[PDB]
Design a protein around this ligand. Structure first.
Ligand SMILES: C/C1=C\CC[C@H](C)OC(=O)C[C@H](c2ccc(O)cc2)NC(=O)[C@@H](Cc2c[nH]c3ccccc23)N(C)C(=O)[C@H](CCCCN)NC(=O)[C@@H](C)C1
Ligand SMILES: Nc1ncnc2c1ncn2[C@@H]1O[C@H](COP(=O)(O)OP(=O)(O)O)[C@@H](O)[C@H]1O
Ligand SMILES: Nc1ncnc2c1ncn2[C@@H]1O[C@H](COP(=O)(O)OP(=O)(O)O)[C@@H](O)[C@H]1O
Ligand SMILES: Nc1ncnc2c1ncn2[C@@H]1O[C@H](COP(=O)(O)OP(=O)(O)O)[C@@H](O)[C@H]1O
Ligand SMILES: Nc1ncnc2c1ncn2[C@@H]1O[C@H](COP(=O)(O)OP(=O)(O)O)[C@@H](O)[C@H]1O
Ligand SMILES: Nc1ncnc2c1ncn2[C@@H]1O[C@H](COP(=O)(O)OP(=O)(O)O)[C@@H](O)[C@H]1O
Ligand SMILES: [Mg+2]
Ligand SMILES: [Mg+2]
Ligand SMILES: [Mg+2]
Ligand SMILES: [Mg+2]
Ligand SMILES: [Mg+2]
Lengths: 371, 371, 371, 371, 371
């Protein structure tokens, strides 16, 4: 009846109904399991916990993320998350509504085929569609032209679109993502003696990162400043009441997005990737993409990231070029919002893969681009 | 009611109404189509763009010119251009006005027959006439005697007229035209490392040529000068803000009109062709044609071309002969203007091919020269 | 009222009024027609040009002479010339004045009968008379005795008159005339590589002949001189500014009047014809004719022709005989002048053929010699 | 020892030995030069090619004909052709044999004088003679009376001979020749869209003309037929395997010999020129020339030309006159054959210009007509 | 003493001595540098590795190619490669032997001038010459006529030569080359989940391409076959012992040479470019070029490419034309071999730029084409 929109990406699950201005179900893509003993199954015990349950009880659980780098690697756990979203968080049977799913570009074909098969079997979704997240992000901004940098937990990617036409030959993807920045911060923090090694401890570091990290406009000057000034230090109170101090780790962590070499990658920084996607585009496109760089995804939420990219692109770009970065307060939910918009359009109504079409065509139908 | 005048030649379309001192609809003879993907037809997308639309959106389009060397080669695209001129640019139904068309001399008979059939079927023009462009150019100058050198995008041609009588046995045509000079410049520029290989890039080179090229009065001295002096270099800013420098390419390009051998042709230069057309004319005609060389067409707009031909013809001509070149600021539109003049004459009123005459006589009527 | 006098002979038309000391209308007997295309009659075009118009526009016209060897061969064109003389050059209606016409002797009777009928029908001349050109030439000289050699464009002829009495049994006519000398020069000039083959080119050769040719007093010595000396060469500038050099062709052309064998004729030279006309005359006449050789007509204008004949006749004549050649600066117009004189005489007033006499007698009246 | 006979005329060179029934060396009068680049002279490259070499390699060469309208215009290239004939094709040193050359009538005197000087200097021919081509053509036919129409590549000419006596006052020459018919066909063919503009392309058109063109007996009926019937169309396969269709161009091309006005000439057609040469001849000659019209030269090879002239002359001629055209299968070589015959005669032995006579008399000896 | 021949093109360096039947030094044009840390310079560590060293140690190195699209972009690294070739691989001082270098056509003039300056300064080569690679490739085949398609790592180009004469106006160049096919395969392979993103991983993909890819004769049928048959799949073992399966990626990669649109280019496929170069050549050249299509360069080594072009050209060509493709087992080394042949010729001995000529003339001497 009303399409469900479900941006079930790496790290965080975001779902709600088409026409909503926000997801209704927002929770971690985590399936947790008891760590210290077996499960006393003759008692009212559980074998696994999902999302918020997994976080509240994390002190006794091993926590796994079924999606790594945008790819579902653990299908049994992924079914548990989808089940939880439909029955515990949104509380809507899948048989009642068509579902719009999202995916990062350049993923294995099998990822879509298996995801489609599940939505058409364990759940029985009347019809479905898998959209590219960057495309949806541009719909959310309202622009028809620009280069969407969708930077999430598992994948960072760039998809240029010109006046509504996709430019598929200039799509770029990096593995560097929020998950790595978090892993890097766990490493950086050992320098001050704070050792976070368990999975629950990883979640604490994720929370530290979200509250304290920022992008330095000038990395070297910020380092020099941190070296002598206590003004860049902030405290954080841990779940058990202990207090720790975070100093230059606050900007050394997100700096890796500009300098991937900090964690051993050959990858270009996010401003170089954006620039290169622009340079692979036709010369008569480039000026419009320079003026329309659209950021979305959770890692774009670091304070100052939009200004740091404005500076870095301007440095690489011609001096007479207009450089503009669009970075709304809604970025974290931009892909979901774009999904809500797309699902409600009258043209998107005719491009749903229906159950009947799926049964006759088989899994390859998921790669249909008839639009 | 009022004849339409439409010089729809190679490269650029020029149309307006008889009695106007200028075309109202001036746009490229280009039909563009999306290059990087198919067309998402369930969305508000287009399959093709025409003229100005094709130029504004050229960064994602393959651009084709339906007319090559004065010959329509792509009739489906030609119908789209004519449609665009009548309905989008002039916004006048063809059923309301007779139409004057133009053509280069020595074209295949089929070109006129097909063009006539379309004007009498897809559009339903009450009456029409196809004029030779060089003849119209002479009408625009106001002279009754002279040798019109009409040099456009696809054809360069010479048509001598003496005191109102055509001299059809001395008509000359070259394939060398503005399109080749542009193609040559794309090649010349690789010497400085600027590689223009796509169709949109061809349009950039065309713009470079129009703004920076000129005819050297003395080619060899201009080359020697360019070799040591920066004074002949000019910059050009590209659509993406990058800047390039053009040096002796500024005069090596148009020099090909005087030296066709630069692109491999056996053709005589434009001053030799003009001279030879004069020499094939009766000895008692020659002195009047020498004194009345009329230039028209877009490639005659290169700065200094009139002076270079004045020098070259004078060198070939008898020393006691008056050599004079007429080259108005309106040359680019001379053929169109001549069409406006002809269409408004009371004698040209009786020589229109009407729909009824066409239906009874068939396509061969287009070759009628009853005047 | 005042008789018109019209020596409309081969090549050149000369007309004016009786009592005038010169023609007022002097123009070529040429009717020209467009050569390269048909006539665009819906435009302000002409089908034919006459006299001076034909010469000014000759580069695009085929030029015909209606009179060949003194005989009108093209009557339609002849009417156009007469029309032009009366209405465009003299601008006098034929109905207002009687007309004196001239004719070469020994012409077909039909030539006079048709000429008379036209003057009495297309034009309505009140009265007319056809005179022999040689007789008029003698009137112009003022002599009553002598042998008039009238040498024009189409006919060369000799008419002896003794003390006012004609001697009709000694009249001689040659076809060799200025037209042949001109045709011969066109042939001679191919030796230096100057090929004149079109009708307009014939007119150029005629002009070359008129300006450069002369009669050698001693042909063989002049040839021997030309063989080693550049002093006999003269340049001529052509209508298109090209320059050519004429050498011994300057005297080889007019020599044909003394040696007709140069063009294949059996005819005697002009000095032999003059001599023979004298020898056919009575022995008591001969001495007076020898002393009164009167030259007239355009070909007598070659410099030195009077001296060459003085020498040639003296060589054929008895050594005790007085040989005298009369050759006025007015020779070109002598026949016309004689016509002016005759038309003004009181005795010539009573010998006009009137319209009434013509209508009653018919065309044979033109042969009336009642004097 | 044995005279060489060399009809080195416009277009095609024909040479062999006196007494032969055919030339041994037959090749185009063409000197070709590389077109697209300079010559890499340090490599085994050539600067120019002659005759067959020029044709085989024509795709990269500019091809020039040293003889235009029967006149040698390029003496350096003419020496190369003569050299090639003597040393590469016949392989006979000029010092060993006297040489008989031919020439069109009414050529510049300088043409013979320069040709003679070369044969007496660059080559050292023991003795030579220059014959008129039409005279030789009559010898080849075996007749002593008739009017030889020699129609080649550069000159069309008529030379009447009566019972062995030449009639030099009735010799006519036209510029219209095979070269113009070929140039006209290149123009006609643009009507079907086949544009031949390079020199090698001219050679293709020449080949098309030779294989497909014919003379219509009734031009107007043949045009009417071509208008509705495919039976007059023939295909031609081009050097690159492409195929073109030639329709009424097959007879419109050679028709120009009967209607020179098709290419802008005032010239009479070939049947009118033949007729006029007859009419300039004595009335007691005319009947024998009418019965002996002899055709020779390559343009007389068009199928049906003899029948078309039979019809046209008969139409102009008196109805009781016998009209006969002689047109042997050997016409193409008739002049050469006549040269072989003349060179072998015992009387022609005493009229050779020897080297000694030349050195003492100088170049003017070439005009000797002592026979 | 013995010229060195060095085809130091994009991707792979090939060098040896003139007269050798093969290069002696064959190694990648790669300069590698440590990736994960700085260089511990107080220890026996290196800052950079070249060629084979760079490949053996690639797991810790960033690898750069100094030549992109045939253009040297990194001159410091290029000097390191040249140094390595002369001193480590061939072990011959440059001062002892003249050197023959090669270059792709239509490169920036600066590329030759800088390359020449280095060979004349950092190394001190007695004399040098820069040859076009396609020309050398034709020498290697032994043919004097044909169209050399040299398809390497950075440039694909077509150079027609006719009977030893170059045809410089029909030279075509594409950017599409082996480097792009490799980049495309890295992208295609993400579909099966194999993500290759680092530079060393690029080298693995290059190796996969070289061992498994082929050209489908019928692309569509090969795709249809791959869709149902495991017979087109091949395994590949990775450096760490893991095994991957490559399916239709085996022919989708090289297909881009026939369909450049697969990677977003407007370029014509290689069979269309070859065809168009032929069509720009003179009609009398075309048949010989069709019969002599010569392939060279590493990308021509894909199995089946010669047969695919035979089919594609035949489809575009006239049906009566002979189409022949020459594709020797030595193609990979054809340019080098041609260099060995040229360097050993006695004519090429006189066209070397010597040190003295260079010092006096300056860098512009490198553009000398005196041959
Ligand atoms: C036999 C021959 C050409 C025909 C090739 C093929 C078998 O037939 C066609 O395809 C016809 C087809 C056709 C097209 C449209 C139509 O309404 C009706 C007909 N013509 C074209 O495209 C013409 C177009 C053209 C260019 N300037 C012209 C000048 C006058 C007339 C035509 C042209 N074009 C490419 C050629 O002539 C080319 C190249 C000329 C430029 C060199 N500087 N010339 C040749 O190869 C030569 C050997 C001649
Ligand atoms: N304020 C913030 N600052 C920095 N990172 C953030 C912030 N909020 C969320 N993130 C990071 O964003 C990622 C999750 O956001 P999201 O883009 O929704 O992920 P995904 O789209 O992969 O589900 C995590 O890596 C998380 O740490
Ligand atoms: N200022 C200029 N200098 C040189 N070339 C010009 C200029 N303006 C236009 N042109 C050339 O003229 C051609 C188009 O002019 P136009 O004569 O109208 O073409 P067409 O008549 O074929 O439509 C193009 O080749 C264009 O580059
Ligand atoms: N100065 C001149 N020298 C030689 N011939 C002349 C000269 N002037 C005129 N003629 C010739 O005279 C002829 C025309 O003179 P004219 O006697 O009036 O002819 P017609 O009486 O036949 O009209 C032409 O042949 C012309 O070339
Ligand atoms: N079969 C033929 N049909 C028509 N023209 C021909 C034929 N054969 C040759 N020609 C033409 O004849 C001319 C060459 O023949 P030829 O008389 O020997 O020339 P020339 O005598 O000037 O050397 C060329 O114009 C050629 O096209
Ligand atoms: N067997 C093969 N199949 C396909 N491509 C190959 C093969 N061998 C080499 N190549 C490709 O050829 C290129 C290098 O060959 P080469 O022509 O020598 O390059 P270059 O001339 O640019 O140095 C690389 O792109 C490489 O992948
Ligand atoms: Mg996401
Ligand atoms: Mg135009
Ligand atoms: Mg007179
Ligand atoms: Mg001949
Ligand atoms: Mg190479």
């Amino acid at each position: 009846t009303t399409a469900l929109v479900c941006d079930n990406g790496s790290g965080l699950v975001k779902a709600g109904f088409a026409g909503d201005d926000a997801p209704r179900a927002v929770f971690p893509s985590i399936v947790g399991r008891p760590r210290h003993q077996g499960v006393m199954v003759g008692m009212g015990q559980k074998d696994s916990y999902v999302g918020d349950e997994a976080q509240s009880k994390r002190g006794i659980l091993t926590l796994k993320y079924p999606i790594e780098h945008g790819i579902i690697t653990n299908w049994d756990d992924m079914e548990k998350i989808w089940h939880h979203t439909f029955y515990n968080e949104l509380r809507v049977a899948p048989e009642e509504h068509p579902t719009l799913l999202t995916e990062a570009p350049l993923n294995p074909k099998a990822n879509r085929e298996k995801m489609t098969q599940i939505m058409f079997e364990t759940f029985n979704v009347p019809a479905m569609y898998v959209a590219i997240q960057a495309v949806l992000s541009l719909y959310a901004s309202g622009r028809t032209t620009g280069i969407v940098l969708d930077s999430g937990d598992g994948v960072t990617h760039n998809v240029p679109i010109y006046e509504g036409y996709a430019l598929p030959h200039a799509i770029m993807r990096l593995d560097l993502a929020g998950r790595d920045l978090t892993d890097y911060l766990m490493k950086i923090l050992t320098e001050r003696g704070y050792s976070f090694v368990t999975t629950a401890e990883r979640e604490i570091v994720r929370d530290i990162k979200e509250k304290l990290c920022y992008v330095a406009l000038d990395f070297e000057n910020e380092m020099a400043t941190a070296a002598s000034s206590s003004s860049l230090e902030k405290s954080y109170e841990l779940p058990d009441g202990q207090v720790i101090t975070i100093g230059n780790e606050r900007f050394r962590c997100p700096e890796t997005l500009f300098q991937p070499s900090f964690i051993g990658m050959e990858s270009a920084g996010i401003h170089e990737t954006t620039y290169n996607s622009i340079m692979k585009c036709d010369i008569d496109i480039r000026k419009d993409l320079y003026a329309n760089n659209v950021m979305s995804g959770g890692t774009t939420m670091y304070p100052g990231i939009a200004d740091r990219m404005q500076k870095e692109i301007t440095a690489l770009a011609p001096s007479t070029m207009k450089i503009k970065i669009i970075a709304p307060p809604e970025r974290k939910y931009s892909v979901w919002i774009g999904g809500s918009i797309l699902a409600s359009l009258s043209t998107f109504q005719q491009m749903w893969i229906t159950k009947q079409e799926y049964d006759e065509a088989g899994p390859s139908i998921v790669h249909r681009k008839c639009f």
